[PDB]
Amino acid sequence: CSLDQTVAPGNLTLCGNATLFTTFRPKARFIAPEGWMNDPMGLYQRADGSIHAGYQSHPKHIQWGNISQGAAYSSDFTSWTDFNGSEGYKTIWPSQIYDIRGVFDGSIIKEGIDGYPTILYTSTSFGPLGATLNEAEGTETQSLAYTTDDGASWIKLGYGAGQNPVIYEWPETNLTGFRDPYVFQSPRLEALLANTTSITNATGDHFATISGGVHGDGARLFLYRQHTTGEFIKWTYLGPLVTTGYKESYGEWSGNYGINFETAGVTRLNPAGAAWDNGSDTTAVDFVTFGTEQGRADHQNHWPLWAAVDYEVRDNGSIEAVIAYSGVQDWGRSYAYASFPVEGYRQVSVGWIYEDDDNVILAKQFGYQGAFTLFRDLFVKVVENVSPSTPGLFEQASWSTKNSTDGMSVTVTTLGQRVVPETLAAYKGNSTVSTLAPVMLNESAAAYTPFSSQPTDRFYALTGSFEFGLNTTAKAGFRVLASEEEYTDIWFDPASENLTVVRTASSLIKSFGNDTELAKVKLYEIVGAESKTLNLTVFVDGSVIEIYANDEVALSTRAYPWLANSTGAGLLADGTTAGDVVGVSGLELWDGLVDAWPARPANTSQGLVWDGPTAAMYGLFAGY
Amino acid sequence: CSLDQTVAPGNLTLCGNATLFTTFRPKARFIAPEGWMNDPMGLYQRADGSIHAGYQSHPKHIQWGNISQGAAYSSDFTSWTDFNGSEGYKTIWPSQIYDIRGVFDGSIIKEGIDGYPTILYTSTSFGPLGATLNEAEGTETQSLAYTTDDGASWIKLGYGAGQNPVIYEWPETNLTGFRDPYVFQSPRLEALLANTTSITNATGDHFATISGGVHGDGARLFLYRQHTTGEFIKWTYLGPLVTTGYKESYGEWSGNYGINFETAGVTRLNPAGAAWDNGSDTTAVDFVTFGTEQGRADHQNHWPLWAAVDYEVRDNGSIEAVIAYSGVQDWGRSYAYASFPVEGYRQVSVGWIYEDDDNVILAKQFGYQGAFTLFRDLFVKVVENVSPSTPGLFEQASWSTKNSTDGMSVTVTTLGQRVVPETLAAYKGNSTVSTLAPVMLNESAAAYTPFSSQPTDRFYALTGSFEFGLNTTAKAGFRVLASEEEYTDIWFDPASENLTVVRTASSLIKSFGNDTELAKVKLYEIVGAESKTLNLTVFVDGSVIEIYANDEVALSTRAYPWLANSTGAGLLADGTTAGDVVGVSGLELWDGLVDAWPARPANTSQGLVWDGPTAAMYGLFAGY
Ligand SMILES: *[C@@H]1O[C@H](CO)[C@@H](O[C@@H]2O[C@H](CO)[C@@H](O[C@@H]3O[C@H](CO[C@H]4O[C@H](CO[C@H]5O[C@H](CO)[C@@H](O)[C@H](O)[C@@H]5O[C@H]5O[C@H](CO)[C@@H](O)[C@H](O)[C@@H]5O)[C@@H](O)[C@H](O[C@H]5O[C@H](CO)[C@@H](O)[C@H](O)[C@@H]5O)[C@@H]4O)[C@@H](O)[C@H](O[C@H]4O[C@H](CO)[C@@H](O)[C@H](O)[C@@H]4O[C@H]4O[C@H](CO)[C@@H](O)[C@H](O)[C@@H]4O[C@H]4O[C@H](CO)[C@@H](O)[C@H](O)[C@@H]4O)[C@@H]3O)[C@H](O)[C@H]2NC(C)=O)[C@H](O)[C@H]1NC(C)=O
Ligand SMILES: *[C@@H]1O[C@H](CO)[C@@H](O[C@@H]2O[C@H](CO)[C@@H](O[C@@H]3O[C@H](CO[C@H]4O[C@H](CO[C@H]5O[C@H](CO)[C@@H](O)[C@H](O)[C@@H]5O[C@H]5O[C@H](CO)[C@@H](O)[C@H](O)[C@@H]5O)[C@@H](O)[C@H](O[C@H]5O[C@H](CO)[C@@H](O)[C@H](O)[C@@H]5O)[C@@H]4O)[C@@H](O)[C@H](O[C@H]4O[C@H](CO)[C@@H](O)[C@H](O)[C@@H]4O[C@H]4O[C@H](CO)[C@@H](O)[C@H](O)[C@@H]4O[C@H]4O[C@H](CO)[C@@H](O)[C@H](O)[C@@H]4O)[C@@H]3O)[C@H](O)[C@H]2NC(C)=O)[C@H](O)[C@H]1NC(C)=O
Ligand SMILES: *[C@@H]1O[C@H](CO)[C@@H](O[C@@H]2O[C@H](CO)[C@@H](O[C@@H]3O[C@H](CO[C@H]4O[C@H](CO)[C@@H](O)[C@H](O[C@H]5O[C@H](CO)[C@@H](O)[C@H](O)[C@@H]5O)[C@@H]4O)[C@@H](O)[C@H](O[C@H]4O[C@H](CO)[C@@H](O)[C@H](O)[C@@H]4O[C@H]4O[C@H](CO)[C@@H](O)[C@H](O)[C@@H]4O)[C@@H]3O)[C@H](O)[C@H]2NC(C)=O)[C@H](O)[C@H]1NC(C)=O
Ligand SMILES: *[C@@H]1O[C@H](CO)[C@@H](O[C@@H]2O[C@H](CO)[C@@H](O[C@@H]3O[C@H](CO[C@H]4O[C@H](CO)[C@@H](O)[C@H](O[C@H]5O[C@H](CO)[C@@H](O)[C@H](O)[C@@H]5O)[C@@H]4O)[C@@H](O)[C@H](O[C@H]4O[C@H](CO)[C@@H](O)[C@H](O)[C@@H]4O[C@H]4O[C@H](CO)[C@@H](O)[C@H](O)[C@@H]4O)[C@@H]3O)[C@H](O)[C@H]2NC(C)=O)[C@H](O)[C@H]1NC(C)=O
Ligand SMILES: *[C@@H]1O[C@H](CO)[C@@H](O)[C@H](O)[C@H]1NC(C)=O
Ligand SMILES: *[C@@H]1O[C@H](CO)[C@@H](O)[C@H](O)[C@H]1NC(C)=O
Ligand SMILES: *[C@@H]1O[C@H](CO)[C@@H](O)[C@H](O)[C@H]1NC(C)=O
Ligand SMILES: *[C@@H]1O[C@H](CO)[C@@H](O)[C@H](O)[C@H]1NC(C)=O
Ligand SMILES: *[C@@H]1O[C@H](CO)[C@@H](O)[C@H](O)[C@H]1NC(C)=O
Ligand SMILES: *[C@@H]1O[C@H](CO)[C@@H](O)[C@H](O)[C@H]1NC(C)=O
Ligand SMILES: *[C@@H]1O[C@H](CO)[C@@H](O)[C@H](O)[C@H]1NC(C)=O
Ligand SMILES: *[C@@H]1O[C@H](CO)[C@@H](O)[C@H](O)[C@H]1NC(C)=O
Ligand SMILES: *[C@@H]1O[C@H](CO)[C@@H](O)[C@H](O)[C@H]1NC(C)=O
Ligand SMILES: *[C@@H]1O[C@H](CO)[C@@H](O)[C@H](O)[C@H]1NC(C)=O
Ligand SMILES: O=C1C=CC(=O)C=C1
Ligand SMILES: O=C1C=CC(=O)C=C1
Ligand SMILES: O=C1C=CC(=O)C=C1
Ligand SMILES: O=C1C=CC(=O)C=C1
Ligand SMILES: O=C1C=CC(=O)C=C1
Ligand SMILES: O=C1C=CC(=O)C=C1
Ligand SMILES: O=C1C=CC(=O)C=C1
Ligand SMILES: O=C1C=CC(=O)C=C1
Ligand SMILES: O=C1C=CC(=O)C=C1
Ligand SMILES: O=C1C=CC(=O)C=C1
Ligand SMILES: O=C1C=CC(=O)C=C1
Ligand SMILES: O=C1C=CC(=O)C=C1
């Protein structure tokens, strides 16, 4: 096993455990110290203003199993500190008959048991578990734990009658899943249900959704309401909040609703961030975010989606969330977005970026799998003075349109996502910033033009504004992680409305994914404008490439170039001419970003272990 | 619910939880503070000379489940102290995927991991578990834990490859069971295997048996040997030690070998107690003790048996234990005898006495189930100068015979059992002792003659020697727990060789068992004697009646008289005449015995709990 990154890669499958630990590893984002991680969980702003972030964790393994909550905290979403207790960085683990198969996702009641922060989590036990298997009641239940030390440790309620698990009866028969409880307060839902509380006797100030579906009949989000304020044992099932069809699709802009929902949440946003009104704010919009499974041929059969909804009150004192329009939270190799409230009327979302090693060829050599996305402020994105001649504008697929009185302009509303400003400020301030001269891409543009300043390593951000003619057939974008022999190409093609990441040349290592990523981007043309603009921000962090367009479209993916000098970046141009010119301005390179884990050494591997021959006898976990 | 014990019992099923806690409860023996208990486990003499006793425990429940080790210690087998830690009197509990279904029986390696006392125990996980079900590999494994604080707490080895569980592969296919590991040293087996250790490479100084059987083909005791001295991970399967047929019986004196063995152990005894020779002591005998299941119509389908064995070395470097003769450890409502070495060349055995409430009608009102037997010294019982005219003597059923040179007398060898002397000394010393005048039971004997001194409560011992003509048809014995309307009759009938406990009148409460108990007793007639003698000792302790005959035959049973004055005792006589006289001598009453748990108040109930609706979903435990 040679680690010589100045020559072609050898047979890296011969390398020892964690020998490639630092080679591709993100340094500027949330990631476990080592081993397997997946979904964010247990997210809350603590009383001291810091952020507590949990995550699905399997230390010293590179596949899922014994799933536990790993945890850390930060004052700025950007620089993190691990918890360190009797179980290292874990703070909740399988320990009881009701959760021995795994401590799945959960969410926080900020003032719960005895006034302490409280997690409601999916406690799993034995039996077939999955949307494509014949799951039975009891395999997935919902349980409580609380913390008296701000997340350093959690105390589970006792096992038994009137204690854990607190939710165990299936609300409908033949579920595909019953997990990922999302607890939230909602002045809006309280106001809508206030006339019906005699029907259900549920009058608490917390709601919870549970994610799942019904065999042969599509996904379901189930809505519960806390039976009594200040009491956390009894949760009353109201009814299904979101009902979608078996592999139903709202279309090209909206992914596919698959057969089962995972990690669903409910929020209410306005142009500034989180909205806490009862329905009185005419600028606020109700949103559901949710993962779907088995409605996609690739990306692990997983869509991370969102929908704007209009609530209707049913005669049985429940809520129907009718989908108004429906979009995609991230078009790439990410899933399991969680959102949580943050002081200053913010709703912050973060997801998991999986690797692109689906055959598990170099996972042991890495010694880890998975990272988070960046933390994103959610808000209602409003575009004013939109031209009615914007192609496809009135399909209203993943946006709403509202005509002016005179019908000559349109207000566009959609979900906005932007990186939290604390992270952008820390990244810029710690980086070597190069402000680049604006560039017209015309008949003289090479296919690839390196920037006048180059990154020094695999940790940088790029920004640019790409101005196109209304009738362009030109393509432009960014090349990143680039040498002569390895590179990753980020293209926008306004004529097709497609943002692509071409990875045919991303790496000389053949075992990593090399499929083209694709997002749809609608350029809302402005009344009076003779051009249309793409604002593109790209984060490069080890192997992560995380793309943001127009504070709306996000695409996370992975690139694993072998060569030490595959770090370069620049502009891409295709079909640019004297007539079809792409104007590039606001160009900046941030070289270096931030060390997100300053207390951690470069190599936090503790080695890998095998569960031994019993792993196959129990049949629950891969065992490695 | 009336607790008036001066009138007929009402409908006691209306009484609250633990309202009958003190009514029938033993006070002079080992019993859990409250709730469910079954098999003794983890028995060892600690370095300070005290006895550590574990037991299968389910606190705050009256049925089996979440089975754990409860524990206590004693300097004299008689007066006990509970451990008290984070889990109350428990010291091992389900906590890992490999043992979450229960911490079953286990036994002690006195100098184990890092030199500490170490338990090898059956760690159970999910799946069908039972001799009549289709069990699969992994459901029952064998795991290690060690104690750095003399049994106050136990540390399990980690889960995984080269750690727990340490024994998981089934040594043969289609097992009925795979549990109750019994660890022992054996100079005898080491000497027998010393010429074969090149075949198996197993050279350690500890052996272990695992109890089970093969579907359709009878019980098996599997023999393992520690692979290397001082190392406790690797145990090498040698082969089956004991192989019996599907519901095979050696006869009327020997119970039935059923379909599956439980709680089996291996020892070597001589006339004085434990034998540590390599085979050189011609007076020593190899013994196996074992429970069998599904070879009995009653007593919970359970026989506690023992056999004398002759070891043969197989060509594959394993041991066959050939049964020489085969007997019964206790003929009553007891099971799961464990034996362990004690300083002074002793082997001490103790079992579990279950209740006689098999339909669980008053278990909640009790607030507990189960007790131990008394602690018994095992030894080789040798009877010299036995007359060859002793009826049935040469069947050699549960004994061996050796003729004198001249063929006119016989030495009889069998398993001896006697109560440990520490308990007899403490009982006698703390009691009001009444030495009773000898009685000839003749034509003038009433059916029942109360003793000249009477017990004051349900805690007493009786002893007597009953001398019969060689051709008697008379019956005699003891009546205990007796008023005019409730009583329990203990009869011996030499003509049938039957010791019976008649319980038709034991209680006015109809829901308790009232079936007649039966043991076989061989009176070895001595050369020159014109009579034969039964030495009978009876312990009455709450509801326990524990009978010992001739330091050989034991019979544990239960009686639950309601009336406060059902405490009396005396002599029984049937068919005694001027010609057929039963001489009764050495009569003594020990009134009071000892308070075995001086630190405990009379009512140690903590209430009962229900596991709730998930108990039926998991399907592992009753839930109460
Ligand atoms: C199979 O058997 C299993 C084993 O028995 C069983 O699991 C056990 O279940 C029991 C019952 O549910 C659990 O017991 C609960 O424990 C909770 C505390 O749990 C935390 O702490 C314990 C103890 O921690 C000590 O010991 C450890 C180990 O040594 C140390 O590491 C600690 O530092 C600490 O040490 C100090 O204290 C020791 C003595 O205890 C000293 O010896 C020592 O020197 C130290 O000074 C830990 O063991 C726990 O860890 C385990 O669990 C966590 C997850 O929680 C895991 O991550 C971890 O790996 C372990 O598995 C844990 O950290 C108790 O709070 C709880 O007691 C409350 O509830 C019960 C009712 O259920 C009440 O009766 C009781 O009064 C308490 O209620 C009051 O208190 C709370 C808040 O304090 C209130 O909300 C509540 O309303 C109530 O208030 C009362 O008082 C009020 C004011 O005073 C008043 O106003 C009210 O009116 C009211 O009266 C309970 O004891 C036990 O932890 C489980 N153990 C394990 C190992 O899992 C399992 O379930 C069984 N399974 C089945 C299928 O049956
Ligand atoms: C799913 O995830 C689960 C959770 O992660 C996982 O379970 C966990 O498994 C891990 C890995 O097996 C277990 O970790 C082991 O822990 C053993 C100790 O266990 C006892 O103590 C812990 C810790 O106790 C502290 O904290 C608790 C809780 O707060 C307190 O109550 C205690 O008082 C104590 O507190 C002090 O210390 C704290 C910091 O730790 C401080 O914060 C605190 O302030 C205090 O001062 C308890 O939690 C355990 O309780 C749990 O387990 C018991 C049963 O054991 C239950 O009854 C209970 O309910 C709980 O469930 C328990 O009491 C360690 O000994 C062990 O470390 C040894 O082994 C590993 C290898 O496996 C080595 O890497 C390591 O070096 C150690 O080996 C050395 O030491 C031993 C002897 O000391 C030697 O025999 C050995 O050879 C070696 O020697 C070394 O040194 C020699 C000389 O120095 C040298 O010569 C040698 O060469 C060599 O180097 C390991 O850490 C963990 O306990 C499990 N946790 C739980 C909650 O279950 C589960 O398996 C997963 N499941 C699956 C399917 O994957
Ligand atoms: C005395 O100790 C007991 C513990 O033993 C404590 O707890 C009680 O324990 C008993 C079992 O011993 C429980 O009984 C069972 O209850 C089931 C239905 O219960 C629901 O209704 C009652 C009101 O009438 C409520 O009290 C319960 O509330 C509690 O549980 C809920 C969760 O549901 C919590 O949220 C609450 O906070 C409470 O803690 C329940 O809502 C019932 O299904 C079950 O029935 C079986 O057993 C009986 C008797 O043998 C049969 O008649 C019946 O047919 C059922 O038999 C099943 O088993 C057979 C074979 O044996 C199968 O063939 C069938 O499939 C069948 O299903 C049982 O009655 C009791 O609920 C529980 N009470 C609690 C927790 O409060 C007592 O509290 C304690 N007393 C005191 C004062 O401390
Ligand atoms: C680097 O990290 C790893 C942890 O990932 C550490 O541990 C190793 O982990 C791997 C898995 O990653 C283990 O590999 C598996 O080994 C199985 C057979 O192992 C036995 O033989 C070897 C010697 O050749 C021994 O080393 C083992 O000893 C250990 O375990 C025993 C218990 O058995 C303990 O008592 C010891 O003390 C040791 O701790 C074993 O005795 C093997 O069955 C398994 O095979 C599957 O996977 C491979 C590769 O993918 C396939 O080729 C193969 O076909 C098997 O595929 C299964 O799965 C497919 C589908 O995927 C199914 O269709 C089939 O049914 C099939 O069964 C695998 O190779 C390895 O044993 C383990 N080593 C240990 C613990 O020492 C490393 O230690 C660590 N390295 C360092 C230096 O730290
Ligand atoms: C980068 O590395 C490769 C291999 O060492 C080398 O061939 C090439 O000239 C270097 N520079 C580039 C591609 O910019
Ligand atoms: C990282 O640390 C682990 C654990 O000590 C070690 O096995 C591995 O070889 C190291 N990897 C690198 C890149 O240094
Ligand atoms: C309320 O009605 C809805 C719509 O029919 C139904 O799906 C749901 O189960 C009902 N809620 C109940 C029965 O609690
Ligand atoms: C919105 O405006 C467009 C362009 O003026 C027009 O075609 C359409 O009919 C309008 N919709 C409504 C509801 O007025
Ligand atoms: C560098 O990053 C840290 C960690 O996020 C941040 O607090 C600090 O303000 C940054 N430095 C700047 C912007 O100068
Ligand atoms: C004992 O109690 C019963 C019921 O109170 C009474 O009838 C009887 O005379 C008393 N004495 C006896 C049976 O010795
Ligand atoms: C024993 O104590 C328990 C628990 O406090 C109580 O419920 C029960 O009624 C008491 N029983 C008696 C006989 O006093
Ligand atoms: C040794 O031989 C016995 C008798 O045939 C057999 O039952 C046992 O399995 C053998 N031991 C092995 C294969 O380890
Ligand atoms: C043992 O003694 C009895 C009575 O003398 C006799 O019948 C029998 O044959 C003897 N057995 C042997 C082996 O000598
Ligand atoms: C009474 O019992 C205790 C507890 O077993 C024992 O130590 C003591 O010696 C006994 N008293 C006597 C025999 O006088
Ligand atoms: O495969 C299936 C499992 C369960 C069910 O309800 C329908 C189909
Ligand atoms: O769906 C998939 C999940 C994980 C993996 O390794 C490959 C495919
Ligand atoms: O450079 C490249 C070579 C071959 C291919 O198919 C894509 C890119
Ligand atoms: O109108 C415009 C068209 C294209 C371009 O590059 C800039 C402006
Ligand atoms: O948080 C930390 C995790 C691991 C390590 O080695 C140092 C710090
Ligand atoms: O859980 C499992 C682990 C390993 C294997 O081979 C099959 C199932
Ligand atoms: O019932 C049965 C279960 C298992 C087996 O091997 C034979 C019979
Ligand atoms: O076999 C049996 C065991 C327990 C019980 O309650 C009744 C019968
Ligand atoms: O006293 C008794 C009454 C009836 C019976 O069958 C047995 C004893
Ligand atoms: O020989 C004897 C027969 C009977 C009896 O009671 C005493 C002596
Ligand atoms: O050992 C003891 C158990 C229980 C109790 O209450 C007092 C002492
Ligand atoms: O384990 C079980 C508990 C209760 C029940 O009704 C069925 C099974």
Author numbering:
A (entry chain A), B (entry chain A): 42 to 665
Give the published text:
Also, the crystals were soaked into hydroquinone in absence of fructose to investigate potential additional binding sites for this acceptor. In the HQ-soaked crystals, a tris(hydroxymethyl)aminomethane (Tris) molecule from the buffer was occupying the position of fructose found in the ternary complexes. As it is observed, a Tris molecule from the buffer and an ethylenglycol moiety from the cryoprotectant are mimicking fructose binding at the ‒1 subsite, while a second ethylenglycol molecule is bound similarly to that observed in the ternary complex crystals. On the other hand, the HQ molecule is stacking against Trp105, with one of its hydroxyls being linked to the C-terminal Leu661 carbonyl through water molecules. As it is observed, HQ and catechol are similarly located in both ternary complexes, while HQ is shifted in the fructose-free HQ-soaked crystals. This may suggest that binding of HQ can be more flexible than catechol binding, what would be consistent with the residual density observed in the ternary complex with HQ above mentioned.
